[PDB]
Design brief:
The PDB classes it as ribosome. The entry lists the keywords A1 cleavage, Dhr1. The entry is titled "Cryo-EM structure of the 90S pre-ribosome from Saccharomyces cerevisiae, state Post-A1". Chain A is Ribosomal RNA-processing protein 9. The structure is cut from a larger assembly and holds chains A (200 residues), B (134 residues), C (246 residues), D (185 residues) and E (445 residues). Chain A is α+β, with helices and mostly antiparallel strands. Chain A contains two helices and eight strands. Helices cover 18% and strands 25% of the residues of chain A. In chain A, the strands form two sheets. A four-stranded antiparallel sheet of chain A has the order 1-2-3-4, with no helix packed on it. In chain A, strands 5-6-7-8 form a four-stranded antiparallel sheet, with no helix packed on it. In chain A, a hairpin with a 3-residue loop joins strand 6 and strand 7. Chain A is elongated. Chain B has a single domain, classed as Alpha-Beta Plaits. Chain B has five helices and four strands. Chain B has a four-stranded antiparallel sheet with strand order 1-2-4-3. In chain B, a hairpin with a 4-residue loop joins strand 1 and strand 2. In chain E, 73% of the residues lie in helices and 0% in strands. Chain E is built from 26 helices and no strands. In chain E, helix 3 packs antiparallel against helix 7, helix 14 crosses helix 16 and helix 20 runs parallel beside helix 22. Chain E is elongated. Classes of the chains: A alpha+beta (200), B alpha+beta (134), C mainly beta (246), D mainly alpha (185), E mainly alpha (445). Chain C binds one RNA strand of 78 nucleotides through strand 11.
Chain lengths: 200, 134, 246, 185, 445
RNA sequence: GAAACUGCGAAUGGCUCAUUAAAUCAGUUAUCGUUUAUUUGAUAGUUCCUUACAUGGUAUAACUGUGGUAAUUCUAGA
């Protein structure tokens, strides 16, 4: 009933899982795992799978798309917090559903599900621009038409799994929701030559 | 469009006066001149001290605008604040009270008059009172 | 004037204090004390202009009356106390000891110092004498009178002094080949081994010093201060170890 | 009982102030670079006179004298950072051969007109002092700013201005309010 | 005369004893922006980062090196439980003030995180704390006392339910600090354990009261333990600013029963009396009335045993405490007096009767003064003259407006041959005063 | 915590250049030819020696009261 005791309960379940995974690995270690899950925070390279990889049998799969000229891809991957212990994703109907967001010169943004590592990326949803989002002034700071009207060029998905933000040659930068692809906010770059090239 | 962004540099933990002294860089684009009250609330939220502990002063907006650089102090308690702060800054932040005194000329003139009176005065007052009573 | 001065103008102050010439008219006249006027650092200059632990003289008063500052083992509360050369200034809440010692550029220099090195202090035996009741004493360069010294201690010889008992731990003679710090004059801060004491009678004995890049210069015996033997300074020197360059 | 701040005279009248060749010289310079003053031309000529006198004395001193090496290398690198002396002319002889046209070309209003944010030199002057033009992040409104090379690449319109950024000026938005009210009636 | 009218200057001297006498314990009476309760990535880690910024001392720097490599998160704490605690205890035993502040704060917050698993380190944690406090006596520092007892208050508050369940072992631990021979150690330790006593429910409270009365009879020779128990219970009852509360009336009922048992020591009954004295001096009658109801109730429950003198002790304390300004109804007190008299069917009776004559209300004395003097004349027969001299010394004009002379005459007629020397001594006393002329006027057998 | 006694300071600071032509002053020396509040460091058991040291004695201020005088930071008697 107390938040400190709730944190202790989640940490105790986490430690049960650690001891069980140490036993299944056995079929020191837990201290090293805890030091790792902290050692993400320090700025030194630690993830050392540089030779465990089997590239010679890495299974490849091309998927042809409909639109022309994909411009960028950014894939959202839910992780687990170490401070609190719920998850990275927002909803409960997601539960770690690997998502991908692709933007293409055809002014199309598309979210795929990529949760399964054997099947193909399944196109969940999409949103397309067009010429009806052309600003009526064209000479002002206001550029806040709810769509994209020319050459989207970069995408990036937020780590909290709520937003994905796209930017292109139209000198806007739009943040869309991740479910309905609805544009929740649009920020002009407020510059005549301020085209957005790359997000991170 | 607008979001005031506070950053601090040169954070010196000074444990002699029980405080942390730094230099506050405020970025306020499309805005002007964020209040010391707002800065003290936000610095209290950042540094987990109380608004009565936090103190700031000496802010200076740059040419063109959009940035004002200043100075700040965060004591380790409101008790250390009331102990080491100057009285004018406690008056600013509402902790102490602005005391009421007469002007410099009035105080110095009362000093000179009382300097010319010797003793307590009351025996002289009785003497001159009966003197004018004759 | 009809008596002793109590004020010091800003431009009248010693140059090595690095006092900037606009923040007022007066500079902290250092009170009478162990060290001379033109080679002393007041605690207000040290705490405010150097360590930046204070912003005002009222904050220097707050620190000193809180009794944090100790200068050679003892608490000082006068804000213009003349903390001089080869001094130990301990701040307890900050856990720092400072040996005050000159830099190469001619200015004073904060030297962070650990406890085992702060526990003692050098001192240039400068006047050895025979006092009342027939006891001998030495007068070092900071007024410290130490009765009953070793019989071999002479003028111009360094004595390592234990602070917490005020006693003489040991001493370092004045011969050619010792490590010599220079304290006054043009070359102050240039640590070099002493080559030859050119000795005149009634004049001033000059001293030929040669330092690690085998450069040679001349100073006076008043400015020479012996530290230790060849390559073995008893104290820890500041960065650069006292070498003037190009 | 303060210490005296130091001041210094920045220009100096020449020897013969009335001379037809020099009058037409200053007319050419003022009309070509958009200046306003013999005061401005004497400012630049005084700086150049000081520079060339220092360079001449360092010439007369001995080669590989440390005074000459130190002060000459410092003078050369300061001029190179200003941009007046090019990279491949890093010598005291070219420092002797510099001129006022080079310095007035490194001024800021000439750089704004050359980069093409303005139609004329006078238009550039007006833009700078109307506070439209920033060098990097800093709004500059001094038409005698003497840019360096990196700054010369960094000159642009300022984010406060109606030209490279935010809301239109009072003339434009007052006209717009007038037309809105006139369409309302 | 402590410093009452403050001066105009800003820095007083404040000697060490003055600072202790000003000092109190309850941080819940205190309040601020608590950093550890404010930011919640981990309590220990939040406090650790704040103290790493604030404190620059050698001892805490070394501790910071070690445990900063260890802890950065909650499972790291939950796994390396023992290493952290042994390092903390190592430096607290190193006993250095400049580092003694943050390690005490971290001990509190470390328990707060490690809650119900702390109960194996808890014992030797308390041991190192009380060793620290006795060392603080050796180096006087009000700072160290305030920190250490705030750490004890925090540990009690964080492990409330378990120590409440196991209350007798906690006071068995704190008795070396509760009965310590220094007024401020007994005061502060009593305040902390008093907070736990206020938190405890009725059954474990009854057990604890029985145990502590047995321990007081064990420490019959000790008086400072008695004083510590007194200040402990009186703060548990008085804890608010002017109003004792429902936990205080429950505490009073429990103490009343377990002191009016036939096994409780009469020294413990005196302790109950002093508790009631402090409470009557502190609180106001509106907040006091239900406690009065509880006391009268328990009197009427257990008035009939071999505890009649014990009841008389508590009742003398009640009627003396301040005055009628705290007493609701001398009529109910009168009913209790007649009950005790009829049950008795000595010296304390004389003391009670004199205190009633002096302090009670005249509107009730108008109808009780007959039965009062008749009870005195019957029961305390040889003692009646001592009672009468005490009454005349306390308040003569009350009995003189009442019938002192007539009852004295009736006593002389009933009995004169047993204590005629006492009669002579009484009259020998009452000659000199010029305020007993009616006693000079009274008649003889 | 007023007043007054006591201690310290009021000899520094601020202004002006009237006087002074080996005088002041600048650089250089000396005190083995002297005084020095303060600051800083050291420093003084003297045990006895023919007939209170758990601690001698006087006053005076401020104050109470009686007054003088045109008047002053005047002061008298008790």
């Amino acid at each position: 009933e107390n938040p400190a005791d709730k944190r202790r309960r989640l940490a105790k379940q986490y430690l049960e899982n650690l001891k069980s995974e140490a036993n299944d690995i056995l079929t020191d270690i837990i201290a090293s795992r805890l030091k790792e899950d902290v050692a993400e925070q320090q700025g030194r390279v630690f993830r050392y799978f540089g030779d465990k990889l089997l590239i010679s049998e890495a299974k490849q799969s091309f998927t042809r798309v409909g639109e022309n000229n994909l411009t960028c891809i950014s894939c959202f991957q839910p992780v687990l917090n170490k401070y609190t212990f719920e998850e990275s994703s927002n909803g409960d109907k997601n539960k770690g559903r690997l998502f991908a967001y692709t933007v293409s010169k055809d002014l199309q943004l598309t979210k795929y599900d990529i949760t399964d590592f054997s099947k193909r990326p399944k196109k969940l949803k999409y949103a397309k621009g067009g010429a009806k989002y052309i600003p009526t002034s064209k000479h002002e700071y206001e550029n806040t038409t709810e769509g994209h009207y020319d050459e989207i060029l970069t995408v990036a998905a937020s780590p909290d799994g709520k937003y994905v933000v796209t930017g292109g040659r139209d000198r806007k930068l739009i943040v869309w929701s991740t479910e309905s692809l609805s544009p929740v906010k649009v920020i002009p770059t407020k510059d005549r030559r301020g085209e957005v090239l790359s997000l991170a | 469009s607008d979001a005031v962004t506070i950053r601090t540099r040169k954070v010196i933990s000074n444990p002699l006066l029980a405080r942390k002294q730094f230099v506050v860089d405020v970025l306020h684009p499309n805005r002007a001149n964020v209040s010391k009250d707002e800065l003290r609330e936000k610095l209290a939220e950042v540094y987990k001290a109380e608004k009565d502990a936090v103190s700031v002063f000496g802010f200076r907006t740059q040419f063109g605008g959009g940035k004002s650089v200043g100075f700040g102090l965060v004591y380790n308690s409101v008790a250390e604040a009331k102990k080491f702060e100057p009285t004018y800054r406690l008056v600013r932040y509402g902790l102490a009270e602005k005391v009421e005194k007469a002007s410099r000329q009035q105080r110095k003139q009362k000093k000179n008059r009382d300097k010319k009176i010797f003793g307590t005065g009351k025996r002289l007052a009785k003497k001159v009172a009966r003197r004018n009573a004759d | 004037a009809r008596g002793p001065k109590k004020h010091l103008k800003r431009l009248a102050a010693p140059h090595h204090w690095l006092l900037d010439k606009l923040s007022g008219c007066y500079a902290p006249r250092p009170s009478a004390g162990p060290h001379k006027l033109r080679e002393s650092l007041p605690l207000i200059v040290f705490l405010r202009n150097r360590l930046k632990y204070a912003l005002n003289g009222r904050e220097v008063k707050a620190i000193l009356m809180q009794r944090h500052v100790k200068v050679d083992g003892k608490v000082r509360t006068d804000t213009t106390y003349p903390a001089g050369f080869m001094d130990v200034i301990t701040l307890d809440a900050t856990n720092e000891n400072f040996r005050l010692v000159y830099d190469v550029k001619g200015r004073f220099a904060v030297h962070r110092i650990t406890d085992e090195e702060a526990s003692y202090k050098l001192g240039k035996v400068k006047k050895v004498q025979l006092g009342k009741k027939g006891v001998p004493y030495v007068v070092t360069h900071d007024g410290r009178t130490i009765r009953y010294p070793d019989p071999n201690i002479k003028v111009n010889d360094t004595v390592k002094i234990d602070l917490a008992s005020g006693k003489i731990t040991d001493f370092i003679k004045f011969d050619a080949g010792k490590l010599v710090y220079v304290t006054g004059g043009r070359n102050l801060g240039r640590i070099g081994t002493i080559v030859h004491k050119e000795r005149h009678d009634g004049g001033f004995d000059l001293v030929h010093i040669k330092d690690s890049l085998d450069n040679t210069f001349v100073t006076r015996l008043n400015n020479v201060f012996v530290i230790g033997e060849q390559g073995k300074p008893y104290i820890s020197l500041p960065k650069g170890k006292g070498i003037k360059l190009s | 009982p303060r210490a005296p701040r130091t001041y210094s005279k920045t220009y100096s009248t020449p020897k013969r102030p009335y001379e037809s060749s020099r009058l037409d010289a200053e007319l050419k310079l003022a009309g070509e670079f958009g200046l306003k003053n013999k005061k401005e031309i004497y400012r630049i000529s005084f700086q150049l006179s000081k520079i060339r006198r220092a360079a001449r004395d360092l010439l007369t001193r001995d080669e590989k004298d440390p005074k000459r090496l130190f002060e000459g290398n410092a003078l050369i690198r300061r001029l190179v950072r200003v941009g007046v002396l090019s990279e491949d002319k890093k010598k005291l002889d070219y420092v002797l051969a510099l001129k006022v046209e080079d310095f007035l070309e490194r001024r800021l209003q000439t750089q704004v007109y050359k980069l093409g944010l303005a139609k004329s030199v006078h238009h550039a002057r007006v833009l700078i002092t109307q506070r439209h033009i920033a060098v990097g992040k800093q709004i500059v409104n001094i038409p005698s700013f003497m840019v360096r090379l990196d700054s010369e690449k960094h000159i642009d319109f300022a984010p406060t201005s109606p030209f490279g950024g935010a809301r239109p000026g009072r003339v434009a938005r007052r006209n717009a309010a007038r037309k809105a009210e006139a369409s309302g009636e | 005369q402590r410093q009452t009218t403050k001066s105009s200057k800003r820095y007083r001297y404040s000697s060490f004893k003055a600072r202790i006498d000003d000092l109190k314990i309850e941080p819940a009476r205190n309040l601020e922006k608590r950093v550890h309760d404010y930011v919640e990535s981990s309590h220990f880690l939040a406090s650790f980062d704040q103290w790493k910024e604030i404190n620059l001392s050698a001892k805490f720097t070394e501790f910071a090196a070690e445990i900063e490599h260890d802890v950065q998160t909650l499972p790291q704490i939950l796994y390396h439980d023992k290493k952290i605690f042994n390092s903390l205890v190592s430096f607290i035993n190193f006993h250095d003030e400049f580092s003694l502040q943050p390690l005490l704060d971290l001990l509190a917050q470390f328990c707060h995180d490690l809650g119900p698993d702390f109960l194996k380190f808890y014992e030797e944690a308390i041991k190192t704390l009380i060793n620290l406090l006795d060392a603080a006596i050796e180096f006087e520092s009000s700072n160290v006392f305030e920190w250490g007892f705030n750490c004890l208050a925090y540990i009690f508050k964080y492990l409330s339910k378990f120590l409440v369940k196991k209350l007798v072992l906690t006071c068995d631990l704190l008795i070396p600090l509760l009965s310590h021979s220094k007024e401020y150690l007994s005061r502060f330790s009593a305040e902390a354990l008093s907070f736990l006593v206020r938190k405890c429910p009725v059954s474990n409270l009854r057990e604890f009261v029985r145990s502590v009365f047995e321990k007081l009879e064990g420490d019959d020779e000790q008086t400072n333990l008695y004083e510590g128990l007194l200040i402990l219970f009186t703060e548990s009852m008085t804890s608010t600013q002017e109003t004792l509360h429902s936990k205080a009336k429950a505490i009073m009922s429990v103490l009343l029963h377990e002191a009016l048992t036939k096994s409780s020591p009469e020294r413990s009954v005196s302790l109950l009396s002093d508790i009631w004295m402090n409470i009557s001096k502190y609180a106001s009658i509106e907040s006091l009335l239900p406690v009065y109801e509880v006391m009268y109730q328990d009197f009427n429950d257990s008035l009939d045993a071999t505890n009649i003198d014990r009841i008389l002790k508590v009742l003398t304390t009640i009627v003396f405490s301040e005055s009628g300004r705290k007493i609701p109804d001398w009529n109910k007190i009168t009913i209790l007096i007649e009950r005790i008299m009829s049950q008795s069917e000595q010296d304390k009776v004389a003391f009670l009767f004199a205190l009633f004559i002096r302090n009670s209300d005249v509107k009730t004395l108008t109808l009780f003064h007959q039965k009062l003097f008749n009870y005195a004349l019957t029961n305390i027969s040889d003692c009646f003259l001592e009672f009468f001299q005490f009454a005349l010394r306390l308040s003569y004009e009350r009995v003189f407006s009442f019938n002192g002379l007539k009852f004295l005459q009736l006593f002389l007629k009933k009995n004169w041959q047993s204590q005629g020397k006492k009669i002579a001594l009484f009259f020998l006393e009452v000659d000199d005063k010029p305020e007993l002329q009616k006693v000079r006027e009274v008649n003889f057998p």
